[PDB]
Design a protein around this nucleic acid. Structure first.
Lengths: 119, 241, 68, 57, 49
RNA sequence: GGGGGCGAGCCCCGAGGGGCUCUCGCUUCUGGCGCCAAGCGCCCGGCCGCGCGCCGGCCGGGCGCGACCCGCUCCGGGGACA
């Protein structure tokens, strides 16, 4: 009481199990070497960068090259407790990433620059 | 009324150019895989080619009633089992030094399983009945052995299935099973089976060895040969008779 | 034992039974791939004489090489 | 318009309220309607003549 | 067809086993027009195309 | 292989019809459409009333015919030769 409907013979869908390993291949998971401190190296004290901070409500940072804009945003928000309007990235011809962090207009840029130390 | 005239018959014409053909039985025309087509047309080659009698003697198989009676007799003499070995060792280990047991006493008769043991105790003429599975996949293991049983005078029979021959022992496959020793309550049934097997295999081994077998054409060509023979009979049988 | 009977049975290759067996096995092995795992030895006496012990771990392949 | 703008457009800007609308012009639609009807009516006529041939012979 | 002196004809059949319009590439005979019913098989009548 | 008949013929014929070879698996005035079954038969579950429930009404499912059966090469063309 079973007939071949189709003239082709396709391979039957057999049951396959999942990875239930008896021992883990590595003893510990790898620690996060892309932390909030290690992802932001330093800000710039360029006069052009300070004009950018004083005029356009931003902060200029030098970032490791393996970073996302979301990573830089959550990194600034985690380190200095300040909200971010947007993160705007480029890569210099020296290997480093440059991040213009446009801040929210409820917090000042010159005050948080005085907090982080640059003037 | 319980009937409704809104129920149109609307039959379907399953003809050429008419309505579409249904999903009918199509097992005749499946593109089967290579191993399926190989194991089918291998048996087709066994049907076509002139099989020599040393291989073709295994199509002669002992029948259903005598096979079930032989299995009923072998079930009385099936060997022991895994952990029944352990019970049999532990019982004699407790019998050794608890109640002055020296144990030379008695072992029950069992069957044999390998072709080596079967050929040795047929050459020793210690066998009484040798069961051979017909469906061993290398046939070279058992070709000589029916002839060897006929030479040594030991009755040999051939049964369907190395699977059900190896279900007598607690294993998967088995090719030869020898009956060495039987009890007095089963010796009469053993002699009846020996007579019924010897009047089928040993007494007409000349007809078995001369029984060539093969050249069985496929039905598509057998029907064509039969059509040509009926055409020749229609052309010249009523011209004479 | 049966291994000596199987030994001279594989020696007598010119007889009709062994010619039929070599024809059927040659067809069956030609209709397969060039290299494939066999689960059991087709010629167990020769396999044992060369060193195949039927236990876990000894594997056999069957393989086609062109002639000439 | 470019065919991915059709993903942006509304439903009534992509077809017309007619059977086979937005995929076939109305002249070929009405010719297809009357063609279906006339082939069906000639099949009815051939079936009636076949039934009369069955009733006679 | 490029590289061919003969014109080809798209001929659409209905597949008698699955609901699908099968198209074919025939070589149209001299006199074959579009909208023509090309028959094919053993019981086909003897006319052009 | 025979069930099916508008059928083409043979034999017997009691003029109902049975066996035998063929026609087919039923489409040619036209740039239309055609799938995921209709109908019948046999069963099953839940609710209500007769209560002897394979009884009656509602809702939900299964199987077979419809779509014949048996087979050992998927069909053909070569083939002991290329």
């Amino acid at each position: 009481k079973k007939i071949r409907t189709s003239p082709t013979f396709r391979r039957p869908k057999t049951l396959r199990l999942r990875r239930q390993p008896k021992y883990p291949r590595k003893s510990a998971p790898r620690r996060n070497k892309l932390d909030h401190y290690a992802i932001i190296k330093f800000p710039l004290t360029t006069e052009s960068a300070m004009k950018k901070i004083e005029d356009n409500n931003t902060l200029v940072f030098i970032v490791d090259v393996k970073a996302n804009k979301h990573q830089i945003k959550q990194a600034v928000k985690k380190l200095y407790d300040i909200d971010v309007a947007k993160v705007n990235t480029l890569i210099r011809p020296d290997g480093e990433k440059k991040a213009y962090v446009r801040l929210a207009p409820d917090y000042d840029a010159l005050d948080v620059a005085n907090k982080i130390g640059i003037i | 009324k319980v009937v409704n005239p809104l129920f149109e018959k609307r039959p379907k014409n399953f003809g050429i150019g008419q309505d579409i053909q249904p999903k009918r039985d199509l097992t005749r025309f499946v593109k089967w895989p290579r191993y399926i087509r190989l194991q089918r047309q291998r048996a087709i080659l066994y049907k076509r080619l002139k099989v020599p009698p040393a291989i073709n003697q295994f199509t002669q198989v002992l029948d259903r009633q005598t096979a079930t009676q032989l299995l009923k007799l072998a079930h009385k003499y099936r060997p022991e089992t895994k952990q029944e070995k352990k019970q049999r060792l532990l019982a004699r280990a407790e019998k050794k030094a608890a109640g002055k047991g020296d144990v030379p006493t008695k072992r029950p008769p069992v069957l044999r399983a390998g072709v080596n043991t079967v050929t040795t105790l047929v050459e020793n003429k210690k066998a009484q009945l040798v069961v051979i599975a017909h469906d061993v996949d290398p046939i070279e293991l058992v070709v000589f052995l029916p002839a060897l049983c006929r030479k040594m005078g030991v009755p040999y029979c051939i049964l369907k299935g190395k699977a059900r021959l190896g279900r007598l022992v607690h294993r998967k496959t088995c090719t030869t099973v020898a009956f060495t020793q039987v009890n007095s309550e089963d010796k009469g049934a053993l002699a009846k089976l020996v007579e019924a097997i010897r009047t089928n295999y040993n007494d007409r081994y000349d007809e078995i060895r001369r029984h060539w077998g093969g050249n069985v054409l496929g039905p598509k060509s057998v029907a064509r040969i039969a059509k040509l023979e009926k055409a020749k009979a229609k052309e010249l049988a009523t011209k004479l008779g | 034992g049966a291994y000596k009977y199987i030994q001279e049975l594989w020696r007598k290759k010119q007889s009709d039974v062994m010619r039929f067996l070599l024809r059927v096995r040659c067809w069956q092995y030609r209709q397969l791939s060039a290299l494939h795992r066999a689960p059991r030895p087709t010629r167990p006496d020769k396999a044992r004489r060369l060193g195949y012990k039927a236990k876990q771990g000894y594997v056999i392949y069957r393989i086609r090489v062109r002639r000439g | 318009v470019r065919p991915k703008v059709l993903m942006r457009l509304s439903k009534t800007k992509k077809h017309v309220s007619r059977a086979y609308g937005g995929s076939m012009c109305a002249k070929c639609v009405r010719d297809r309607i009357k063609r279906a009807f006339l082939i069906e009516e000639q099949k009815i006529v051939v079936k009636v003549l076949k039934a009369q041939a069955q009733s006679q012979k | 067809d490029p590289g061919r002196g003969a014109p080809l004809a798209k001929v659409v059949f209905r597949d008698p086993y699955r609901f699908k319009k099968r198209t074919e590439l025939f070589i149209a005979a001299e006199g074959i027009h579009t909208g023509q019913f090309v028959y094919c098989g053993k019981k086909a009548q003897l006319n052009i195309g």
